[PDB]
Write a protein that binds this ligand. Structure first.
Ligand SMILES: Cc1cc2nc3c(=O)[nH]c(=O)nc-3n(C[C@H](O)[C@H](O)[C@H](O)COP(=O)(O)O)c2cc1C
Length: 363
């Protein structure tokens, strides 16, 4: 079933082998600008059922990693247009993953050199990636954030809305909202990072308010069948847990998302260091509540993907590190060929080496 077609909102994927969103930190600074090298990398992977791009800033304030691209400036839009054109010339489909990093950021890359923003003024207690004076990736402790004022929230929603308009002009087929992995939307969702006492904190209805406002805004801006969302609502991701009622709160959010008729729900099931697997009973509860495509991710093998797709519990799988290393992952999985070995030392930063130099089966 991995190599059978799937309707994903407004587009049709020819197979269920998707490229997960992968931050690679190779954009130009100043300007957070995508490059022709990035275009080549994505073009190489155009046989994917769907490419989901690296996380991309909705605004300058959204930036948390040096080398991550934006989709807010004219120069960024022009560069992304070239990248999507190359994917489409090879008959691929590409979604842009949009983020605001919130507290997973550093003052030195924020507007004005000021503290980054979040739901509450609590440090993430982790690291982000900056660049040194020679342009090389380095890890730095996160800056303690400032809590957003209530009157600043509409601007955040508008920044998501505008980035989606920009994505449409840039030629993306779909947008994926990053509501996972401890970034800004997840910072509001989780009671561990959200201690607000206004209508954006406290109850699950209040904690989900921002993400649902964003979903409504972007569905109105473009179309519901162009919108996907990534969540990581069970377990701990980048020091952000999901609170003491994680299953119930996840099912609440999913039931609300379903009302908007969005294209897909993408679940990041565990982080790279691992965690408890999803139960089939939980997967069935998610199916009961969501009527679009469900994508699973997190250390999947083709065997596990086939098992869960065959069981009718998910529709597609997003592979991360296997897609870094195998531009033709679809053909390799379909033919049961060996995969290229991974070189994790070049996942972040640098240039062509460890990026565009992983070969296909045939030249
Ligand atoms: C180098 C690297 C960068 C990542 N960047 C992102 C990202 O930009 N957005 C996101 O939602 N997840 C990100 N992730 C998670 C992946 O999308 C994916 O869920 C994970 O790699 C799946 O596990 P796998 O690599 O075992 O297939 C990243 C993972 C890696 C290894």
């Amino acid at each position: 079933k991995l190599f059978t077609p799937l309707k994903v909102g407004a587009v049709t994927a020819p197979n269920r082998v998707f490229m997960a969103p992968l931050t690679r930190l190779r954009s130009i600074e100043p300007g957070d600008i995508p490059t022709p090298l990035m275009g080549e990398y994505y073009r190489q992977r155009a046989s994917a059922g769907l490419i989901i791009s690296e996380a991309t800033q909705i605004s300058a304030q959204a930036k948390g990693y040096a080398g991550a691209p934006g989709l807010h400036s004219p120069e960024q839009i022009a560069a992304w247009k070239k990248i999507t054109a190359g994917v489409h010339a090879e008959d691929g489909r590409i979604a842009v993953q949009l983020w605001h990093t919130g507290r997973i950021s550093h003052s030195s890359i924020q507007p004005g050199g000021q503290a980054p923003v979040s739901a509450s003024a609590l440090n993430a207690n982790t690291r982000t990636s900056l660049r040194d004076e020679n342009g090389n990736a380095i890890r730095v402790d996160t800056t303690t954030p400032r809590a957003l004022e209530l009157d600043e929230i509409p601007g955040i929603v508008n920044d998501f809305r505008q980035a989606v308009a920009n994505a449409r002009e840039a030629g993306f087929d779909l947008v994926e909202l990053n509501s996972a992995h401890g970034y800004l939307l997840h910072q509001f969702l989780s009671p561990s990072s959200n201690q607000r006492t206004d209508q954006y904190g406290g109850s699950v209805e209040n904690r989900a308010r921002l993400v649902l406002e964003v979903v409504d805004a972007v569905c109105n801006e473009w179309s519901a069948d162009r919108i996907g969302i990534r969540v990581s609502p069970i377990g701990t991701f980048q020091n952000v847990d999901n609170g003491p009622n994680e299953e119930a709160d996840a099912l609440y959010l999913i039931e609300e998302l379903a009302k908007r008729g969005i294209a897909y729900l993408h679940m990041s099931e565990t982080d790279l260091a691992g965690g408890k697997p999803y139960s089939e009973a939980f997967r069935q509860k998610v199916r009961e509540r969501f009527h679009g495509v469900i994508i699973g991710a997190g250390a999947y093998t083709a065997e596990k993907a086939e098992d869960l797709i065959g069981k009718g519990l998910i529709d597609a799988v997003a592979f991360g590190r296997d897609y870094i290393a195998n531009p033709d992952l679809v053909a390799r999985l379909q033919k049961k060929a060996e995969l290229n070995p991974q070189r994790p030392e070049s996942f972040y930063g640098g240039g062509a080496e460890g990026y565009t130099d992983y070969p296909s089966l045939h030249h």
